Each structure stands twice: as C-alpha cells, then as structure tokens.
C-alpha cells in the first residue's frame, strides 16, 4: 500500500533496466502513469546528460568501488545514504544517484551480473523512499521532480 | 563513504545548473 515506494521503484527500475539492456519496456506505466511516464521521460533526458557530462567522475567511482556481485550492491547502499548526510536534499543529488545507478547497471550487464540490477534499483529506491520520504512528499513526489527539471522555453 | 562528498558536490552542481533553467 506504499504507493510512493511502488512508483519510485517503477521509475528507477525501468531506467536502470533500459539503460543496461538498451531496450525500452513498451508496457505502459502503472496507474498514476501520467506522472510516472513524465518522470521516466525526464529521467532519461537529465540522466543521460549527467552520465555523458560526468562520465569521468562516474568511471572513477565505479573503478574504486569494485562492484562485482550483489554484496557490493549492499555496500553501495551505505555510501548512497551519505549523499544527504550534510542535511541537504535536492533533486540534483537525487538524479545524480539514479544516474550513477544506471551507469553501474550497464557495468553489471557487461560482466554478466544482470541479476544484480534489480537489487541495485531496489537499494536506490530504499535509500530515497525509506530515508527521505518526508522531503519527497513535500515536493509532491515525482511531480516535483518533473516540474523542477522542466526547462522553461520563454520567447 | 569517503567518496561521499564527491557525490554531494556533483549533485549540487547539477541542481545549480537546472535551478537557473
């Protein structure tokens, strides 16, 4: 009955899955799909840009974390919690976490560890929803995400 | 976890980029 968790896992897992496999899931999103569809479209636009602009930072972090199996995914959860340890929460940090998740998911697929992608998506969702639920709700959840990353075209 | 601040700073750069968008 935790709709925020379900919706968050749907968006994050869909992005990690399509990034790792290179194939979009052509099923419609679950109900509340307008918001979820827009969020995944926004996440593609922003997340693809983050991975391209910051590939060097992402490759360096991946190389040092040495992610090989599902135990390393759990270790990554500890690190991800520290993304908010200074008391600051914003959508830039949240999308950076998800973007790195996609970056790692692509790595896991290349090393025949696709079974680790779903645990990775769940871990990212766990950190976001189980430790920053209150902030997410204040933003109107994924609607706030869509509206923040909406680039205004004002002629 | 020592790498944590790197993620925070990068995330803040991304937030700052879109905040003026």
| DSSP secondary structure, A11-23, as one string | HHHHHHHHHHHS-
- Helix axes of A141-148 and A3-21: crossing angle, nearest 10 degrees: 50
Please name the residue of chain A whose CA is at the shortest distance from the CA of residue B15: A92
* Class of CATH domain A3-149: mainly alpha
Distance CA A24, CA A93 (A): 25
Q: Does A23 touch chain B (CB under 8 A)?
A: no
Contacts of B21 in chain A (CB under 8 A): 151-152
Nearest to A132 by CA among A119, A146, A145, A120: A145
Three-state secondary-structure class, residue A154: coil
Cα A132 versus chain centre, distance: 14
Output DSSP code: residue B11.
Answer: H
**C-beta of residue B12 within 8 angstroms of C-beta of residue A87:** no
The backbone torsions φ and ψ at residue A114, rounded to the nearest 5 degrees and listed phi first, read: -55, -30
Chain A interface disruption, residue of B13, B14, B16, most A CBs within 10 A: B14
B12–A90 CB contact, under 8 Å = yes
Distance CA A22, CA A6 (A): 23
The backbone torsions φ and ψ at residue A87, rounded to the nearest 5 degrees and listed phi first, read: 85, 0
Resolution, Å (one decimal): 1.6
Largest CA distance in chain B: 31
Two tokens, residue A66: 């040495």
Cα atoms found within 13 Å of the Cα of residue A102, Cβ hemisphere only:
28
Three-state secondary-structure class, residue B1: coil
Two tokens, residue A15: 């992005």
Distance CA A152, CA A35 (A): 18
A92–B11 CB contact, under 8 Å = yes
Instruction: Please name the residue that has the structure tokens 């020592």.
Output: B2
A78–B1 CB contact, under 8 Å = yes
Output DSSP code: residue A152.
Answer: -
Two tokens, residue A76: 């990554």
**C-beta of residue A72 within 8 angstroms of C-beta of residue A118:** no
**C-beta of residue B4 within 8 angstroms of C-beta of residue A100:** no
Cα distances (Å, whole numbers) of residue A69 to A102, A105, A111, A155: 16, 11, 10, 50
A93–B13 CB contact, under 8 Å = no
Two tokens, residue A83: 């993304």
Number of Cβ within a 10 Å radius of residue A124: 28
């Amino acid at each position: 009955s935790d709709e925020l968790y379900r919706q968050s896992l749907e968006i994050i897992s869909r992005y990690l899955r399509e990034q790792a496999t290179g194939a979009k899931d052509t099923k419609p999103m679950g109900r509340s799909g307008a918001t979820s569809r827009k969020a995944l479209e926004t996440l593609r636009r922003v997340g693809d840009g983050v991975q391209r602009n910051h590939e060097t930072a992402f490759q360096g972090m991946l190389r040092k974390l040495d992610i090989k199996n599902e135990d390393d995914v759990k270790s990554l959860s500890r690190v991800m919690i520290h993304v908010f340890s200074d008391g600051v929460t914003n959508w830039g940090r949240i999308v950076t976490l998800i973007s790195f998740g996609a970056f790692v998911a692509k790595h896991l697929k290349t090393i025949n560890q696709e079974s680790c992608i779903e645990p990775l998506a769940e871990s990212i969702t766990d950190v976001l929803v189980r430790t920053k639920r209150d902030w997410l709700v204040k933003q109107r959840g994924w609607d706030g995400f869509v509206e923040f990353f909406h680039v205004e075209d004002l002629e | 976890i020592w790498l944590a601040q790197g993620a925070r700073r990068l995330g803040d750069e991304i937030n700052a980029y879109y905040a003026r968008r």
